[PDB]
Amino acid sequence: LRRGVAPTVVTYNTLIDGLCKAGKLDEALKLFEEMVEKGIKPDVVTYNTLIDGLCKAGKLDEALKLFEEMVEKGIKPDVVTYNTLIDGLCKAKLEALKLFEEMVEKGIKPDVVTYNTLIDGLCKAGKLDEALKLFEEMVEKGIKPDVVTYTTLIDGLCKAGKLDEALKLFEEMVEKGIKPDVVTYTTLIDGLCKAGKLDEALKLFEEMVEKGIKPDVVTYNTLIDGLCKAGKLDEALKLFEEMVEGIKPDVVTYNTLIDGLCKAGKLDEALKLFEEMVEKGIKPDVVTYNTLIDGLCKAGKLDEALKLFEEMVEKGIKPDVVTYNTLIDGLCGKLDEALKLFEEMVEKGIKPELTYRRVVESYCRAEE
């Protein structure tokens, strides 16, 4: 902190980076003000850091202001600036493409990260043909696809249902000497599980280790989820144990099991898992409470579901739109209660398709 050593702009950028990635955007922004007050000019990296923090914190519009502020100052937005906005716009919407042409008009060549950012956006938007189009184009520009590039297309193909094309594209990635990492293998493993081929997924998982590729928690979470969906609830509890025998399970690990257990009716074993993660200092997020609220709702235990909603609120976890979609749906026949909860998420500041669909079908069989 302090410090007879005068901080550099590099010093504030690091702290601003750490603050933004800790959600602490308001605290990340007072640092911005402090540094001008000392006569230390925020640079392009300073704006790019705050812009990224704003996008990932869902304040896209606030980030677009910062882009305008920097331009007004003569602090030129660069390839990183555009890459940051393009991803931010993709993840919110697919505006990102006008920036991809705008950056070229500023003399900024798009790079491998730009192409990777847009290929993913196009896939997650159902525009896989468009994404494959960009893949061809970047090889034309002499941009060499990397492990992220090939992993983004393998994911999209799988999620579109083109698992064998995914398997084919992975094959050529080793031909070109691009070494797959744990994210690559997990993506194929997730794809095989989503496609009902659990043993082909374990075969690959073992091939991942024999290649010397160490799994992480996502890998096991992916594998555990495949086991819960497949109905292999015990083999997924085995995997949760074997996991430690040295990977630390995380919240998503617990969320996945808690969900498998809820959907099977094993509400007890779910609640004691929810108790174990807390005691183990693993904080339940919003999916944790969403999973249990739906579980208790589908089971006919709405009072306990509402009880759990309060407790989630009584603990600083903010309920999102899934929370309300679940509860709103859950009250089928507490007409006004359901309607009540809809206005409450408006006042809380949560953008509502399912929400509207559920309220109207509630209004109708109750023309309002």
Partner RNA sequence: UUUUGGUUUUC
Asked if residue 131 binds RNA (CB under 7 A), the reply is no
Burial group, residue 295, by CB count within 10 angstroms (0-12, 13-18, 19+): buried
Query: Which of 77, 96, 117, 296 touches RNA by CB under 7 A?
Result: 117
Distance, CA of 227 to CA of 306 (rounded, Å): 29
**Nearest to RNA of 199, 367 (CB atom):** 199
Strand stretches in the chain, DSSP E: none
**Identity of the residue numbered 132:** L
Asked if residue 362 binds RNA (CB under 7 A), the reply is no
Asked if residue 44 binds RNA (CB under 7 A), the reply is yes
Asked if residue 317 binds RNA (CB under 7 A), the reply is no
Only segment of 62-70, 80-88, 95-103, 272-280 that touches RNA (CB under 7 A): 80-88
Asked if residue 147 binds RNA (CB under 7 A), the reply is yes
Asked if residue 157 binds RNA (CB under 7 A), the reply is no
Question: Which DSSP symbol is given to 280?
Answer: T
Only segment of 40-48, 126-134, 164-172, 236-244 that touches RNA (CB under 7 A): 40-48
**Nearest to RNA of 295, 367 (CB atom):** 295
Footprint (CB under 7 A) of RNA, residues 266-305: 286-287, 290-291, 294
Contact 151, 188 (CB under 8 A): no
C-alpha triplet 180, 213, 167: angle, nearest 5°: 40
Only segment of 22-30, 49-57, 198-206, 309-317 that touches RNA (CB under 7 A): 49-57
Burial group, residue 182, by CB count within 10 angstroms (0-12, 13-18, 19+): middle
Asked if residue 45 binds RNA (CB under 7 A), the reply is yes
Query: Which of 113, 143, 163, 198 touches RNA by CB under 7 A?
Result: 113
**Nearest to RNA of 290, 362 (CB atom):** 290
Asked if residue 329 binds RNA (CB under 7 A), the reply is yes
At closest approach, how far in Å is the CB of 155 from RNA?
4
Asked if residue 181 binds RNA (CB under 7 A), the reply is yes
Going from the C-alpha of 17 to that of each of 8, 13, 39, 56, 295, the distances in angstroms are 14, 6, 20, 12, 38
Helix, strand, coil percentages in the chain from 3-state DSSP, rounded to 5: 70, 0, 30
Only segment of 41-49, 59-67, 127-135, 339-347 that touches RNA (CB under 7 A): 41-49
Query: Where do we find the tokens 């956006």?
Result: 121
Query: Which of 40, 75, 79, 167 touches RNA by CB under 7 A?
Result: 79
Which string of x and - marks every residue 230-269 that binds RNA (by CB under 7 A)? ---------------------xx--xx--x----------
Asked if residue 184 binds RNA (CB under 7 A), the reply is yes
Residues 6+ apart with CB under 8 A from 192: 163, 198, 200, 201, 204, 226
Distance, CA of 272 to CA of 83 (rounded, Å): 44
Distance, CA of 191 to CA of 185 (rounded, Å): 10
Closest among 256, 259, 217, 224 to 238, alpha carbons compared:
224
Contact 104, 70 (CB under 8 A): no
Query: CB neighbours (10 Å) of residue 360?
Result: 12
Asked if residue 183 binds RNA (CB under 7 A), the reply is yes
Asked if residue 219 binds RNA (CB under 7 A), the reply is yes
Would you tell me which residues interact with RNA (CB under 7 A)?
9-10, 13-14, 17, 44-45, 48-49, 52, 56, 79-80, 83-84, 87, 112-113, 116-117, 120, 147-148, 151-152, 155, 180-184, 186-187, 190, 215-219, 221-222, 225, 251-252, 255-256, 259, 286-287, 290-291, 294, 321-322, 325-326, 329, 354
